[PDB]
Design a protein around this ligand. Structure first.
Ligand SMILES: *[C@@H]1O[C@H](CO)[C@@H](O[C@@H]2O[C@H](CO)[C@@H](O)[C@H](O)[C@H]2NC(C)=O)[C@H](O)[C@H]1NC(C)=O
Ligand SMILES: *[C@@H]1O[C@H](CO)[C@@H](O)[C@H](O)[C@H]1NC(C)=O
Ligand SMILES: *[C@@H]1O[C@H](CO)[C@@H](O)[C@H](O)[C@H]1NC(C)=O
Ligand SMILES: [Cl-]
Lengths: 120, 313
């Protein structure tokens, strides 16, 4: 409910400053979320996808708006761009795209039931 | 102060209130939680459960009519208490209860025990001792209420299940941590609503013990499987909730909100018991054509949605 400022270093500077908790992963405090998304920092650093960072935080530190309080996830397209760019890397070591970033759970542009974040 | 509101409080109860003063707020919320769910479970029926008072006054003398509905009210009140007491103790912070710490057997393979398992046993025992501090009557109504209170309690135990957190790399569920936990209270309300639909009807018999005549309940229809400790019992016929009951049964259905689409009870032929229904139209303002903007905000347009509300005559 309450919008709290984003503290996790990775997700500072992504274009929105305010999140809420708990997120979709039942992270109770924003630090607990942080200690997971920061495991992705090497992937952000390699620049396999230029959407990776925004996509990650759009799930771990979801945008929180004073004006509008309905769901606002990333669009499936954002995730799909990120998966296209970075899953190959993880596969070279035998790892699948993580279950938590499964893109098919996310809405597409034009969903009546909910809006979604992506550029155009 | 607290337990004061109870209108036939006996000293055994007051002692309990004072011994367990630290968890009496959660007993009170327990009752409020159960009656809230009652009102949800019957949100569209002729009797919508807004008769019932949500204070601790429900503890103490049970004198309401022995209808199926009461069987459900008291059941879900007991369960609410067992629920909210267990939930509160799990929130830590209290001297006389907390998480269930007793050694749980070796875990399933993927996971380790952890977190805070809810002490459902403590809540059930609190529910029972407080109800049982009531003065004891050889009443038929007291035999029914002892039965249904226990059915409500016991399913708080029955509904304990496993809940696990997944941590390890990127949240992968291969480092798992589990604890015993309660469902949402909605599971409880749905469960008891079913038990309400199958409640066994009884008849009253009486035999003497050393303190005079006691009354016991016996299944009215012997050919069926008798009710169990988890089933609801009752022995008076429920009234006709159509008309305002002059014997304070309840109100009529007049000006209760109605559904033209439905041909069940929440529909306007059945809810209004063959009387007509009025209709008025209303307008609310709301946000409707909200565009997202890259980045990152949302813009909304104001528009006026119109609907019609049918209320029974
Ligand atoms: C539950 O039932 C009662 C009455 O059956 C409803 O309360 C009445 O609502 C009508 C119309 O709003 C009023 O004329 C009365 O003053 C209300 N209060 C009474 C009789 O005490 C109540 O709104 C119903 N609630 C539901 C269906 O949620
Ligand atoms: C978030 O805070 C920074 C200042 O550190 C500011 O430059 C940025 O524009 C802010 N974001 C929004 C959406 O206001
Ligand atoms: C009215 O009844 C119809 C059919 O049962 C149902 O689909 C609809 O959701 C009901 N309206 C409300 C507000 O429940
Ligand atoms: Cl009862």
């Amino acid at each position: 409910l309450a919008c709290q400022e984003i503290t996790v270093p990775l997700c500072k500077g992504i274009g929105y400053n305010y999140t809420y908790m708990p997120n979709q992963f039942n992270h109770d405090t924003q630090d607990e979320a942080g200690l997971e998304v920061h495991q992705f920092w090497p992937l952000v650093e390699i620049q396999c996808s230029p959407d990776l960072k925004f996509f990650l935080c759009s799930m771990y530190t979801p945008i929180c708006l004073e004006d509008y309080k309905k769901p606002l996830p990333p669009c499936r397209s954002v995730c799909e761009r990120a998966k296209a760019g970075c899953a190959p890397l993880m596969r070279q070591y035998g790892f699948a795209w993580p279950d938590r970033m499964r893109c098919d759970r996310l809405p597409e542009q034009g969903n009546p039931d909910t809006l979604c974040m992506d550029y155009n | 102060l607290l337990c004061g509101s109870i209108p036939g409080l006996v000293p055994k109860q007051l002692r309990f209130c004072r011994n367990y003063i630290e968890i009496m707020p959660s007993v009170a919320e327990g009752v409020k939680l159960g009656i809230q769910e009652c009102q949800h479970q019957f949100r569209g029926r002729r009797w919508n459960c807004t008769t019932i008072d949500d204070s601790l006054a429900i503890f103490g003398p049970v004198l309401d009519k022995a209808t199926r509905e009461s069987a459900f009210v008291h059941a879900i009140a007991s369960a609410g208490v067992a629920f909210a007491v267990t939930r509160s103790c799990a929130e830590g912070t209290s001297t006389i209860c907390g998480c269930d710490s007793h050694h749980k057997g070796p875990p399933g393979e993927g996971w380790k025990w952890g977190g805070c398992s809810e002490d459902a046993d403590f809540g059930v025992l609190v529910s029972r001792e407080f109800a049982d501090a009531r003065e004891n009557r050889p009443d038929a109504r007291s035999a029914m209420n002892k039965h249904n209170n226990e059915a409500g309690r016991t399913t708080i135990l029955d509904h304990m299940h496993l809940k696990c957190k997944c941590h390890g790399l990127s949240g992968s569920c291969e480092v798992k941590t589990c604890w015993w936990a309660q469902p949402d209270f909605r599971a409880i309300g749905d469960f008891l609503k079913d038990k309400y639909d199958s409640a066994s009807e009884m008849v009253v018999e009486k035999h003497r013990e050393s303190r005079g005549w006691v009354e016991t309940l016996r299944a009215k229809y012997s050919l069926f499987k008798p009710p169990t400790e988890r089933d609801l019992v009752y022995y008076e016929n429920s009234p006709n909730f159509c008309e305002p009951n002059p014997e304070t049964g309840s109100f009529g259905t007049r000006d209760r909100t109605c559904n033209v689409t439905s041909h069940g009870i929440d529909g306007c032929d059945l809810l209004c018991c063959g009387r007509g229904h009025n209709t008025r139209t209303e307008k609310r303002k709301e946000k409707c054509h909200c565009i997202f903007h890259w980045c990152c905000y949302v813009s909304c347009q104001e528009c006026i949605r119109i609907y019609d509300v049918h209320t029974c005559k």
